[PDB]
């Protein structure tokens, strides 16, 4: 039924229907949810197979083409505010990602942001999740977020481990060994150990130089490592610094 074009990276192909499409080689709820800033779901197929709106850019490559230079501040904050519009609307209708980064994250010549690739390469899990935490909550999408902020902004990834023990080791090298002061519970962790490292929490303004005060601050709220006092998108999209929103459009080249 469908012209393959060529493989975008199951296994995902851009194919031609003449509608061009994202076929996903490997739920019909989802394809009646319909948001701005999340990837249309058109059809289910089980003969699994979903077919998605195809956009032709991802944050990744386009970070990638814009390392030099660095994406521009006001983008940056129109990409934030748009991801943090659709996680709300998500999480609203109490659908998690789990697995968001930059290139689960879609763009296009319009300024428009969307989130794909859903969960329904360990560089964006949330402490809770690398802890064995099992009933983890819409805070792991916001954490996930934060990281891929503070990327934008320092042209680096936050926390680039390569593997678990170093994933959350990186985290506490930055954040602080967490202890039941700041995350109640978390040494009832299914993984956590006490003989984990005690490291010191860096000064804030360290990690992500060039950002300014209101988004140090929103970034630490999404950072926070008990998921119950992460902010949350909703919470997030009132934080000032998004009092001087615009929708830029970014320069592709496709
Ligand atoms: O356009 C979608 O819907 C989509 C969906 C998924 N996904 O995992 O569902 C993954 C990527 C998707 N776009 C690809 C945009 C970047 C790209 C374009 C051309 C060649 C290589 C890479
Ligand atoms: O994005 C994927 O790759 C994906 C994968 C599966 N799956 O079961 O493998 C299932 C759904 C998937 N996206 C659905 C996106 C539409 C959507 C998402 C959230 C809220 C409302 C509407």
């Not at 934030?80 to 879609?106: E, I, M």
Request: hydrophobic residues 45%.
């Amino acid at each position: 039924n469908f012209q393959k074009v060529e493989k975008i990276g199951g296994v995902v192909y851009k194919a031609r229907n003449g509608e061009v499409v994202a076929l996903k080689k490997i739920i019909s709820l989802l394809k009646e949810l319909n948001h701005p800033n999340i990837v249309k779901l058109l059809d289910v197929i089980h003969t699994l197979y979903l077919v998605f709106e195809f956009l032709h850019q991802d944050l990744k490559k386009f970070m990638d083409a814009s390392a030099l230079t660095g994406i521009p501040l006001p983008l940056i904050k129109s990409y934030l505010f748009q991801l943090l519009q659709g996680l709300a609307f998500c999480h609203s209708h109490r659908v998690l990602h789990r697995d968001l980064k930059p290139q689960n994250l879609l763009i296009n010549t319009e300024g428009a942001i969307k989130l794909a690739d859903f969960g329904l390469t360990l560089w964006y899990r949330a402490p809770e999740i690398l802890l064995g935490c099992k009933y983890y909550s819409t805070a792991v999408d916001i954490w996930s977020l934060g990281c891929i902020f503070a990327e934008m902004v320092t042209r680096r990834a936050l926390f680039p481990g390569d593997s678990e023990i170093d994933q959350l080791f990186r985290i506490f090298r930055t954040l602080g060994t967490p202890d039941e002061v700041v995350w109640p519970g978390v040494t009832s962790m299914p993984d956590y150990k006490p003989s984990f490292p005690k490291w010191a929490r860096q000064d804030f303004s360290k990690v992500v130089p060039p950002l300014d005060e209101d988004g140090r601050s929103l970034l630490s709220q999404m950072l926070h490592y008990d998921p119950n006092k992460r902010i949350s998108a909703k919470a997030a999209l009132a934080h000032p610094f998004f009092q001087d929103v615009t929708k830029p459009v970014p320069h592709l080249r496709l």
